[PDB]
């Protein structure tokens, strides 16, 4: 079965890269503004320092993930003002200079879909949120530089110095990689652009509609903002004391008796903090395991052409485009899928004069009356010649060899 | 997390940033590569009398590829480079004695610890 | 070190030394002090065990990547970009370091680039010729076909290109002549 048409298709892929950086104060959360609790917590050995160190290691790692993902170009390439890409319309993904935050249309859709006082109560309880090192307006510049370097220089900008090349020949070189000759592009170019633009157009309509696609990027936000609620609820508990407010205990009891109640309260608040620290330490490893995969995919699918099956999308890979989303990266993979099929009767070889002729690069087929040789991933029949097949052995050992003739183009010229 | 006053002691060249309040660092208008990160795209560095300054970090040099629809760029010469890459493979192997670490040489401590089921093992 | 430092902490007991409590206290009063020290030290040991369990997986995630790099970069030639070093990959060498491995990657980078005026195809007599493997280039007057990653100009011949259709659909095709090497030798 040989395909006749093809089809270009664009599909999205979501990947979280980092989470929010938080830091709780052990002494402030456990005690508050009292000194007796401070002395007792000092009687406990070093439990607060380890927690403060772990919750700082996590926050440092969160700023290395984002650097490793996006910051892969050592220049900031800029697209030329004159847009002549042979018919491909990149306006939806290239930056819009109008709005002050230089982000494209799809990036704005993605930003509006995700939804990031609950914060104030946590803030007034020893909790805080450190800001990210790279502001989003600066990540939307790394992604723009990457996308502008991809569409004007190919895979060369990631392996040295960027070398320009027309986009049509870049598509020809990307077809030639997956097993389709160059002339399939040029003789159908006007078609392919019309198949690309539409493919992009259905993406934004799939984002502005009522669909749940950013769920994998919303789940981490929900989980991280949910753990804090339990961490704060655990502060409003008796744990065996008379009351959950340290001020009341210090107000209606002398030190030598209030000491045991304060101890009962500390031995529960410290454990409620330790559980949260451990949960965060596990989530950090999960998020880093995702961030490294994101970096690998960014470096292989975007900055080159992949040959690993089902890595950069379903089908055969042509290219990809990156976009930034809150705490994540969104890839747009462009692929190539055969469309219309036809049956044929094939043979492994052709016995001409007792010699077995094998195809050089292609496959023998027949429409029931005559035999041709064609490429594997498209239907383009050609005459069988000696400049198109190579001889090997004799037509006695091949299982299913058939009978036919070979053109031998050299002979008629001498005539 | 202090808006800039609410700070106890002031001084010279008080700077307000998106990451907090910066005291003791002059503000410049240039932009270099990040040396000491602060937050919200602010980095500080020590340079030339000598002073500590804080700026908005620069992503890198900006160039535009001379892209035209009938123009190509072919290399003519190459270079063989060699890089290095370090990877950890393993860490040290440790082991503890649960009885010795908690109690040590005492014998009544072992009898008292035996109540806890199987934590040591 | 921290696991040892936790020994020098009262945890609420009278004295952090186990013997000194029992030296100057009767059994059924010192029992609670010893029971407090026991649980304090037990929690201090559980914390260390958990931290080691997390760090072991953190290290194994890198050990597997090192095994993969040794299999692919060293025992063969890779094509995944930026995997075995910046640039096109040629070969790597391993070295051993305390608790780790050091890869020396040898890579190939183009150096000196020149501008050229190009063309998708050449059509000779109503037949469109496409390059078999290479790109058509020119220095402003004459046309050549070269390989992509190194400038080696070479004359266009019939056994250097291949024909497919007429030059009516190709967008930016330009006229030139094709050598046809058989004819002069036929003379
Ligand atoms: C291969 O390319 C496309 C496959 O979709 C076909 O082009 C369309 O054909 C239909 C049928 O006549 C027309 O109505 C459309 O206007 C064509 N263009 C588009 C963009 O849909 C083309 O016919 C296919 N070739 C063969 C031989 O089937
Ligand atoms: C590429 O796509 C854009 C977006 O669809 C096209 O821009 C439209 O152009 C028409 C013509 O005046 C306007 O009425 C629309 O408002 C434009 N769209 C938007 C979103 O502003 C554009 O024509 C397409 N082609 C090229 C070559 O850019
Ligand atoms: C199979 O394809 C061949 C293509 O060669 C068809 O043969 C052609 O038939 C037309 C019809 O008159 C002739 O004008 C051509 O000269 C034939 N080509 C030759 C002889 O090379 C053949 O008809 C096809 N068979 C079927 C069943 O469709
Ligand atoms: C394919 O061609 C070969 C060579 O012409 C055929 O082999 C001969 O076929 C004749 C036909 O009767 C026999 O008498 C000979 O004994 C065969 N072998 C020789 C000449 O060495 C072969 O039969 C053809 N395949 C077919 C017809 O299916
Ligand atoms: C920090 O707090 C001060 C105090 O309100 C803010 O300063 C005010 O800024 C507005 C806007 O220009 C002025 O109209 C007021 O007169 C200012 N108040 C004073 C006392 O000077 C300042 O904006 C706050 N900073 C931030 C980042 O919120
Ligand atoms: C490619 O670059 C290398 C750079 O080393 C050139 O080799 C240098 O050539 C100059 C002039 O002859 C010598 O002075 C240097 O000593 C050479 N370098 C080395 C390392 O041997 C080489 O000539 C360039 N290629 C071409 C075709 O000029
Ligand atoms: C473009 O390259 C061609 C091929 O090298 C140059 O043509 C040669 O020019 C030299 C000096 O003028 C002559 O000695 C050769 O006989 C020419 N060869 C051919 C095949 O024509 C041409 O001069 C170059 N163009 C420019 C502007 O330098
Ligand atoms: C490439 O060559 C063909 C053939 O020489 C050119 O086609 C000629 O174009 C002129 C200009 O209108 C016509 O008057 C002739 O009738 C055409 N056919 C001939 C001369 O056989 C074509 O214009 C050329 N393309 C270029 C130079 O870009
Ligand atoms: C090939 O023939 C079989 C026989 O019925 C049929 O089922 C199949 O659909 C045909 N292939 C195509 C691509 O139509
Ligand atoms: C930086 O530039 C602004 C104007 O954009 C100016 O008001 C300010 O004084 C400059 N800072 C210095 C230190 O010159
Ligand atoms: C190639 O052309 C561009 C555009 O004029 C120019 O900036 C560049 O310097 C040229 N290349 C070389 C090697 O001079
Ligand atoms: C390249 O674009 C220009 C318009 O800027 C056009 O005149 C020219 O024909 C194009 N190149 C080719 C090969 O068609």
Short mmCIF file of N, CA and C in Angstrom, two decimals, chain A residues 260-408:
data_model
loop_
_atom_site.label_atom_id
_atom_site.label_comp_id
_atom_site.label_asym_id
_atom_site.label_seq_id
_atom_site.Cartn_x
_atom_site.Cartn_y
_atom_site.Cartn_z
N UNK A 260 5.00 22.67 80.66
CA UNK A 260 4.57 21.40 80.09
C UNK A 260 3.58 21.59 78.95
N UNK A 261 2.66 22.56 79.08
CA UNK A 261 1.72 22.82 78.00
C UNK A 261 2.43 23.37 76.76
N UNK A 262 3.38 24.28 76.95
CA UNK A 262 4.14 24.79 75.82
C UNK A 262 4.92 23.66 75.16
N UNK A 263 5.47 22.74 75.95
CA UNK A 263 6.18 21.60 75.38
C UNK A 263 5.26 20.73 74.55
N UNK A 264 4.06 20.44 75.07
CA UNK A 264 3.08 19.67 74.31
C UNK A 264 2.72 20.35 73.00
N UNK A 265 2.68 21.68 72.98
CA UNK A 265 2.35 22.38 71.74
C UNK A 265 3.50 22.36 70.74
N UNK A 266 4.73 22.52 71.22
CA UNK A 266 5.89 22.52 70.34
C UNK A 266 6.07 21.16 69.69
N UNK A 267 5.91 20.09 70.48
CA UNK A 267 6.14 18.76 69.93
C UNK A 267 5.11 18.36 68.88
N UNK A 268 4.09 19.18 68.65
CA UNK A 268 3.16 18.94 67.57
C UNK A 268 3.35 19.88 66.41
N UNK A 269 3.62 21.16 66.71
CA UNK A 269 3.88 22.10 65.63
C UNK A 269 5.14 21.75 64.85
N UNK A 270 6.20 21.30 65.54
CA UNK A 270 7.41 20.90 64.84
C UNK A 270 7.18 19.74 63.88
N UNK A 271 6.42 18.73 64.30
CA UNK A 271 6.08 17.62 63.42
C UNK A 271 5.20 18.02 62.25
N UNK A 272 4.21 18.90 62.48
CA UNK A 272 3.41 19.43 61.39
C UNK A 272 4.25 20.20 60.38
N UNK A 273 5.33 20.84 60.81
CA UNK A 273 6.24 21.48 59.87
C UNK A 273 7.12 20.48 59.13
N UNK A 274 7.61 19.46 59.83
CA UNK A 274 8.46 18.45 59.20
C UNK A 274 7.73 17.71 58.09
N UNK A 275 6.46 17.38 58.30
CA UNK A 275 5.71 16.67 57.25
C UNK A 275 5.63 17.50 55.97
N UNK A 276 5.34 18.79 56.11
CA UNK A 276 5.28 19.67 54.95
C UNK A 276 6.63 19.76 54.25
N UNK A 277 7.71 19.86 55.03
CA UNK A 277 9.04 19.93 54.41
C UNK A 277 9.32 18.68 53.58
N UNK A 278 8.99 17.50 54.12
CA UNK A 278 9.24 16.27 53.37
C UNK A 278 8.40 16.21 52.09
N UNK A 279 7.12 16.59 52.19
CA UNK A 279 6.28 16.58 50.99
C UNK A 279 6.85 17.50 49.91
N UNK A 280 7.31 18.69 50.31
CA UNK A 280 7.90 19.60 49.33
C UNK A 280 9.18 19.02 48.74
N UNK A 281 9.98 18.33 49.55
CA UNK A 281 11.21 17.73 49.03
C UNK A 281 10.91 16.67 47.98
N UNK A 282 9.80 15.95 48.11
CA UNK A 282 9.46 14.97 47.08
C UNK A 282 8.93 15.65 45.82
N UNK A 283 8.04 16.64 45.99
CA UNK A 283 7.51 17.34 44.82
C UNK A 283 8.62 18.03 44.03
N UNK A 284 9.65 18.53 44.71
CA UNK A 284 10.75 19.18 44.00
C UNK A 284 11.47 18.21 43.08
N UNK A 285 11.72 16.99 43.55
CA UNK A 285 12.35 16.00 42.69
C UNK A 285 11.47 15.65 41.51
N UNK A 286 10.15 15.53 41.72
CA UNK A 286 9.27 15.26 40.58
C UNK A 286 9.32 16.39 39.55
N UNK A 287 9.27 17.64 40.01
CA UNK A 287 9.27 18.77 39.08
C UNK A 287 10.60 18.86 38.34
N UNK A 288 11.71 18.59 39.02
CA UNK A 288 13.00 18.58 38.33
C UNK A 288 13.09 17.46 37.30
N UNK A 289 12.54 16.29 37.61
CA UNK A 289 12.50 15.21 36.63
C UNK A 289 11.71 15.62 35.39
N UNK A 290 10.67 16.43 35.57
CA UNK A 290 9.96 16.98 34.41
C UNK A 290 10.74 18.07 33.69
N UNK A 291 11.44 18.93 34.43
CA UNK A 291 12.18 20.03 33.82
C UNK A 291 13.33 19.54 32.96
N UNK A 292 14.03 18.49 33.39
CA UNK A 292 15.10 17.94 32.55
C UNK A 292 14.58 17.35 31.25
N UNK A 293 13.44 16.66 31.29
CA UNK A 293 12.81 16.19 30.06
C UNK A 293 12.43 17.36 29.16
N UNK A 294 11.91 18.44 29.76
CA UNK A 294 11.58 19.62 28.97
C UNK A 294 12.82 20.20 28.29
N UNK A 295 13.94 20.26 29.01
CA UNK A 295 15.17 20.78 28.42
C UNK A 295 15.66 19.90 27.28
N UNK A 296 15.62 18.58 27.46
CA UNK A 296 16.03 17.67 26.39
C UNK A 296 15.16 17.82 25.16
N UNK A 297 13.84 17.87 25.34
CA UNK A 297 12.93 18.05 24.22
C UNK A 297 13.17 19.39 23.52
N UNK A 298 13.39 20.45 24.30
CA UNK A 298 13.68 21.75 23.72
C UNK A 298 14.94 21.70 22.86
N UNK A 299 15.98 21.02 23.35
CA UNK A 299 17.25 21.03 22.64
C UNK A 299 17.25 20.11 21.42
N UNK A 300 16.43 19.06 21.41
CA UNK A 300 16.45 18.13 20.28
C UNK A 300 15.37 18.40 19.24
N UNK A 301 14.12 18.62 19.65
CA UNK A 301 13.07 18.84 18.66
C UNK A 301 13.18 20.23 18.04
N UNK A 302 13.46 21.25 18.84
CA UNK A 302 13.48 22.62 18.34
C UNK A 302 14.77 22.91 17.57
N UNK A 303 15.92 22.63 18.18
CA UNK A 303 17.21 22.98 17.61
C UNK A 303 17.73 21.94 16.64
N UNK A 304 16.85 21.13 16.06
CA UNK A 304 17.26 20.12 15.11
C UNK A 304 16.05 19.31 14.68
N UNK A 305 16.32 18.26 13.93
CA UNK A 305 15.27 17.36 13.45
C UNK A 305 15.44 16.02 14.15
N UNK A 306 14.38 15.56 14.80
CA UNK A 306 14.43 14.34 15.58
C UNK A 306 14.09 13.14 14.71
N UNK A 307 14.72 12.01 15.02
CA UNK A 307 14.43 10.75 14.36
C UNK A 307 13.92 9.69 15.32
N UNK A 308 13.69 10.04 16.58
CA UNK A 308 13.11 9.12 17.55
C UNK A 308 11.60 9.11 17.40
N UNK A 309 11.03 7.91 17.27
CA UNK A 309 9.61 7.78 16.98
C UNK A 309 8.78 8.23 18.18
N UNK A 310 7.76 9.05 17.91
CA UNK A 310 6.78 9.47 18.92
C UNK A 310 7.43 10.24 20.06
N UNK A 311 8.56 10.88 19.80
CA UNK A 311 9.19 11.74 20.80
C UNK A 311 8.65 13.17 20.71
N UNK A 312 8.72 13.76 19.52
CA UNK A 312 8.26 15.13 19.27
C UNK A 312 6.92 15.15 18.54
N UNK A 313 6.01 14.26 18.88
CA UNK A 313 4.68 14.24 18.31
C UNK A 313 4.44 13.02 17.44
N UNK A 314 3.17 12.81 17.12
CA UNK A 314 2.75 11.67 16.31
C UNK A 314 2.99 11.97 14.84
N UNK A 315 3.62 11.03 14.15
CA UNK A 315 3.92 11.20 12.74
C UNK A 315 5.41 11.30 12.51
N UNK A 316 5.81 11.96 11.43
CA UNK A 316 7.21 12.25 11.17
C UNK A 316 7.47 13.70 11.55
N UNK A 317 8.66 13.97 12.06
CA UNK A 317 8.94 15.29 12.62
C UNK A 317 9.53 16.21 11.57
N UNK A 318 9.02 17.44 11.53
CA UNK A 318 9.57 18.49 10.68
C UNK A 318 10.20 19.60 11.50
N UNK A 319 9.46 20.19 12.43
CA UNK A 319 10.02 21.21 13.31
C UNK A 319 9.10 21.39 14.51
N UNK A 320 9.50 22.30 15.39
CA UNK A 320 8.70 22.64 16.55
C UNK A 320 8.92 24.11 16.89
N UNK A 321 7.95 24.67 17.61
CA UNK A 321 8.02 26.06 18.04
C UNK A 321 7.71 26.12 19.53
N UNK A 322 8.50 26.85 20.32
CA UNK A 322 8.24 26.95 21.75
C UNK A 322 7.41 28.17 22.11
N UNK A 323 6.67 28.04 23.21
CA UNK A 323 5.92 29.15 23.78
C UNK A 323 6.01 29.04 25.29
N UNK A 324 5.90 30.17 25.97
CA UNK A 324 5.99 30.21 27.42
C UNK A 324 4.60 30.32 28.03
N UNK A 325 4.39 29.60 29.12
CA UNK A 325 3.15 29.63 29.89
C UNK A 325 3.52 29.76 31.35
N UNK A 326 2.60 30.22 32.20
CA UNK A 326 2.95 30.41 33.62
C UNK A 326 3.45 29.12 34.24
N UNK A 327 4.73 29.12 34.60
CA UNK A 327 5.41 27.98 35.22
C UNK A 327 5.48 26.78 34.28
N UNK A 328 5.64 27.01 32.98
CA UNK A 328 5.73 25.88 32.08
C UNK A 328 6.03 26.31 30.66
N UNK A 329 6.26 25.31 29.82
CA UNK A 329 6.58 25.52 28.41
C UNK A 329 5.62 24.71 27.56
N UNK A 330 5.20 25.29 26.44
CA UNK A 330 4.25 24.68 25.53
C UNK A 330 4.92 24.53 24.18
N UNK A 331 4.98 23.30 23.68
CA UNK A 331 5.59 23.03 22.39
C UNK A 331 4.51 22.84 21.34
N UNK A 332 4.78 23.35 20.14
CA UNK A 332 3.92 23.15 18.97
C UNK A 332 4.73 22.33 17.98
N UNK A 333 4.37 21.06 17.81
CA UNK A 333 5.08 20.16 16.92
C UNK A 333 4.39 20.14 15.57
N UNK A 334 5.17 20.30 14.50
CA UNK A 334 4.68 20.22 13.13
C UNK A 334 5.11 18.87 12.55
N UNK A 335 4.15 18.14 11.99
CA UNK A 335 4.40 16.77 11.57
C UNK A 335 4.02 16.53 10.11
N UNK A 336 4.00 15.27 9.70
CA UNK A 336 3.75 14.90 8.31
C UNK A 336 3.12 13.52 8.30
N UNK A 337 1.86 13.42 7.87
CA UNK A 337 1.09 12.19 7.94
C UNK A 337 0.61 11.84 6.54
N UNK A 338 0.87 10.64 6.03
CA UNK A 338 0.31 10.24 4.73
C UNK A 338 -1.20 10.11 4.80
N UNK A 339 -1.87 10.43 3.69
CA UNK A 339 -3.32 10.59 3.70
C UNK A 339 -4.07 9.55 2.86
N UNK A 340 -3.79 9.45 1.57
CA UNK A 340 -4.60 8.63 0.67
C UNK A 340 -3.78 7.48 0.11
N UNK A 341 -4.38 6.29 0.10
CA UNK A 341 -3.65 5.05 -0.06
C UNK A 341 -4.12 4.31 -1.31
N UNK A 342 -3.24 3.50 -1.88
CA UNK A 342 -3.64 2.64 -2.98
C UNK A 342 -2.88 1.32 -2.93
N UNK A 343 -3.57 0.25 -3.34
CA UNK A 343 -2.99 -1.08 -3.41
C UNK A 343 -2.10 -1.23 -4.64
N UNK A 344 -1.10 -2.11 -4.53
CA UNK A 344 -0.22 -2.43 -5.64
C UNK A 344 0.33 -3.84 -5.43
N UNK A 345 0.80 -4.44 -6.52
CA UNK A 345 1.44 -5.74 -6.49
C UNK A 345 2.93 -5.56 -6.69
N UNK A 346 3.72 -6.09 -5.76
CA UNK A 346 5.15 -5.82 -5.70
C UNK A 346 5.95 -7.11 -5.85
N UNK A 347 7.23 -6.94 -6.16
CA UNK A 347 8.19 -8.02 -6.29
C UNK A 347 9.51 -7.58 -5.68
N UNK A 348 10.34 -8.52 -5.23
CA UNK A 348 11.64 -8.14 -4.65
C UNK A 348 12.70 -7.81 -5.68
N UNK A 349 12.65 -8.45 -6.85
CA UNK A 349 13.69 -8.27 -7.85
C UNK A 349 13.09 -8.42 -9.24
N UNK A 350 13.93 -8.21 -10.25
CA UNK A 350 13.54 -8.29 -11.65
C UNK A 350 14.63 -9.04 -12.41
N UNK A 351 14.28 -10.18 -12.99
CA UNK A 351 15.22 -10.95 -13.80
C UNK A 351 15.14 -10.47 -15.24
N UNK A 352 16.24 -9.91 -15.75
CA UNK A 352 16.29 -9.32 -17.08
C UNK A 352 16.93 -10.26 -18.10
N UNK A 353 18.17 -10.66 -17.87
CA UNK A 353 18.90 -11.57 -18.75
C UNK A 353 19.59 -12.63 -17.91
N UNK A 354 18.85 -13.20 -16.96
CA UNK A 354 19.46 -14.05 -15.96
C UNK A 354 20.10 -13.30 -14.81
N UNK A 355 19.97 -11.98 -14.78
CA UNK A 355 20.54 -11.15 -13.73
C UNK A 355 19.43 -10.54 -12.90
N UNK A 356 19.60 -10.56 -11.58
CA UNK A 356 18.61 -10.00 -10.66
C UNK A 356 18.91 -8.53 -10.44
N UNK A 357 17.93 -7.68 -10.74
CA UNK A 357 18.05 -6.24 -10.55
C UNK A 357 17.32 -5.84 -9.28
N UNK A 358 18.04 -5.23 -8.34
CA UNK A 358 17.45 -4.74 -7.12
C UNK A 358 17.35 -3.22 -7.15
N UNK A 359 16.34 -2.64 -6.50
CA UNK A 359 16.21 -1.18 -6.51
C UNK A 359 17.33 -0.52 -5.73
N UNK A 360 17.72 0.66 -6.20
CA UNK A 360 18.76 1.42 -5.51
C UNK A 360 18.21 2.07 -4.25
N UNK A 361 17.16 2.88 -4.40
CA UNK A 361 16.43 3.45 -3.27
C UNK A 361 14.98 3.57 -3.72
N UNK A 362 14.15 2.62 -3.31
CA UNK A 362 12.78 2.60 -3.78
C UNK A 362 12.21 1.20 -3.70
N UNK A 363 11.13 1.00 -4.45
CA UNK A 363 10.30 -0.20 -4.36
C UNK A 363 9.65 -0.44 -5.71
N UNK A 364 9.60 -1.71 -6.11
CA UNK A 364 8.92 -2.08 -7.35
C UNK A 364 7.42 -2.19 -7.10
N UNK A 365 6.63 -1.67 -8.03
CA UNK A 365 5.17 -1.73 -7.97
C UNK A 365 4.64 -1.95 -9.37
N UNK A 366 3.34 -2.24 -9.45
CA UNK A 366 2.66 -2.43 -10.72
C UNK A 366 1.19 -2.10 -10.55
N UNK A 367 0.62 -1.42 -11.54
CA UNK A 367 -0.81 -1.14 -11.57
C UNK A 367 -1.60 -2.19 -12.34
N UNK A 368 -1.04 -3.39 -12.49
CA UNK A 368 -1.71 -4.49 -13.13
C UNK A 368 -1.27 -4.77 -14.55
N UNK A 369 -0.59 -3.82 -15.20
CA UNK A 369 -0.20 -4.02 -16.59
C UNK A 369 1.28 -3.74 -16.82
N UNK A 370 1.85 -2.81 -16.05
CA UNK A 370 3.24 -2.43 -16.23
C UNK A 370 3.90 -2.25 -14.87
N UNK A 371 5.23 -2.32 -14.86
CA UNK A 371 6.02 -2.29 -13.64
C UNK A 371 6.82 -1.00 -13.57
N UNK A 372 6.80 -0.36 -12.40
CA UNK A 372 7.54 0.86 -12.15
C UNK A 372 8.28 0.73 -10.83
N UNK A 373 9.17 1.69 -10.56
CA UNK A 373 9.87 1.77 -9.28
C UNK A 373 9.65 3.16 -8.70
N UNK A 374 9.27 3.21 -7.43
CA UNK A 374 8.86 4.45 -6.79
C UNK A 374 9.47 4.57 -5.41
N UNK A 375 9.43 5.77 -4.85
CA UNK A 375 9.89 5.97 -3.49
C UNK A 375 8.88 5.41 -2.50
N UNK A 376 9.35 5.18 -1.27
CA UNK A 376 8.56 4.42 -0.31
C UNK A 376 7.42 5.23 0.30
N UNK A 377 7.63 6.53 0.54
CA UNK A 377 6.68 7.34 1.29
C UNK A 377 5.88 8.29 0.41
N UNK A 378 5.86 8.06 -0.90
CA UNK A 378 5.05 8.85 -1.81
C UNK A 378 4.90 8.06 -3.10
N UNK A 379 3.88 8.39 -3.87
CA UNK A 379 3.64 7.70 -5.14
C UNK A 379 4.15 8.58 -6.27
N UNK A 380 5.24 8.16 -6.89
CA UNK A 380 5.81 8.86 -8.04
C UNK A 380 6.47 7.82 -8.93
N UNK A 381 5.70 7.16 -9.80
CA UNK A 381 6.26 6.06 -10.58
C UNK A 381 7.31 6.54 -11.57
N UNK A 382 8.32 5.69 -11.78
CA UNK A 382 9.41 5.98 -12.70
C UNK A 382 9.70 4.74 -13.52
N UNK A 383 10.29 4.96 -14.70
CA UNK A 383 10.66 3.85 -15.57
C UNK A 383 11.83 3.10 -14.95
N UNK A 384 11.85 1.78 -15.13
CA UNK A 384 12.94 0.96 -14.62
C UNK A 384 14.10 1.02 -15.60
N UNK A 385 15.27 1.45 -15.12
CA UNK A 385 16.45 1.59 -15.96
C UNK A 385 17.65 0.97 -15.26
N UNK A 386 18.79 0.98 -15.96
CA UNK A 386 20.04 0.52 -15.36
C UNK A 386 20.68 1.59 -14.49
N UNK A 387 20.37 2.86 -14.74
CA UNK A 387 20.81 3.93 -13.87
C UNK A 387 19.91 4.11 -12.66
N UNK A 388 19.04 3.14 -12.40
CA UNK A 388 18.10 3.21 -11.30
C UNK A 388 18.04 1.94 -10.47
N UNK A 389 18.62 0.84 -10.95
CA UNK A 389 18.71 -0.42 -10.22
C UNK A 389 20.13 -0.94 -10.31
N UNK A 390 20.50 -1.82 -9.38
CA UNK A 390 21.83 -2.43 -9.38
C UNK A 390 21.71 -3.94 -9.44
N UNK A 391 22.63 -4.58 -10.16
CA UNK A 391 22.59 -6.02 -10.39
C UNK A 391 23.33 -6.73 -9.27
N UNK A 392 22.89 -7.95 -8.97
CA UNK A 392 23.54 -8.77 -7.96
C UNK A 392 23.12 -10.22 -8.17
N UNK A 393 24.07 -11.08 -8.50
CA UNK A 393 23.77 -12.50 -8.60
C UNK A 393 23.01 -12.85 -9.87
N UNK A 394 22.25 -13.94 -9.79
CA UNK A 394 21.45 -14.42 -10.90
C UNK A 394 20.06 -14.79 -10.40
N UNK A 395 19.07 -14.70 -11.29
CA UNK A 395 17.67 -14.88 -10.92
C UNK A 395 17.37 -16.36 -10.71
N UNK A 396 17.97 -16.91 -9.66
CA UNK A 396 17.75 -18.30 -9.27
C UNK A 396 17.51 -18.50 -7.78
N UNK A 397 17.92 -17.56 -6.93
CA UNK A 397 17.86 -17.76 -5.49
C UNK A 397 16.82 -16.87 -4.81
N UNK A 398 16.41 -15.77 -5.43
CA UNK A 398 15.39 -14.92 -4.83
C UNK A 398 14.05 -15.63 -4.84
N UNK A 399 13.31 -15.51 -3.74
CA UNK A 399 12.09 -16.30 -3.56
C UNK A 399 11.02 -15.88 -4.56
N UNK A 400 10.76 -14.58 -4.67
CA UNK A 400 9.65 -14.12 -5.48
C UNK A 400 9.99 -13.23 -6.65
N UNK A 401 11.10 -13.52 -7.34
CA UNK A 401 11.49 -12.68 -8.47
C UNK A 401 10.52 -12.89 -9.63
N UNK A 402 10.38 -11.85 -10.46
CA UNK A 402 9.43 -11.84 -11.56
C UNK A 402 10.17 -11.53 -12.86
N UNK A 403 9.39 -11.45 -13.94
CA UNK A 403 9.91 -11.25 -15.28
C UNK A 403 9.55 -9.84 -15.76
N UNK A 404 10.54 -9.13 -16.29
CA UNK A 404 10.34 -7.80 -16.84
C UNK A 404 11.62 -7.40 -17.57
N UNK A 405 11.59 -6.22 -18.18
CA UNK A 405 12.71 -5.71 -18.95
C UNK A 405 13.21 -4.41 -18.34
N UNK A 406 14.43 -4.03 -18.71
CA UNK A 406 15.10 -2.85 -18.19
C UNK A 406 15.48 -1.95 -19.36
N UNK A 407 15.29 -0.64 -19.18
CA UNK A 407 15.35 0.29 -20.31
C UNK A 407 16.76 0.41 -20.88
N UNK A 408 17.79 0.46 -20.02
CA UNK A 408 19.18 0.59 -20.44
C UNK A 408 19.37 1.85 -21.29
#
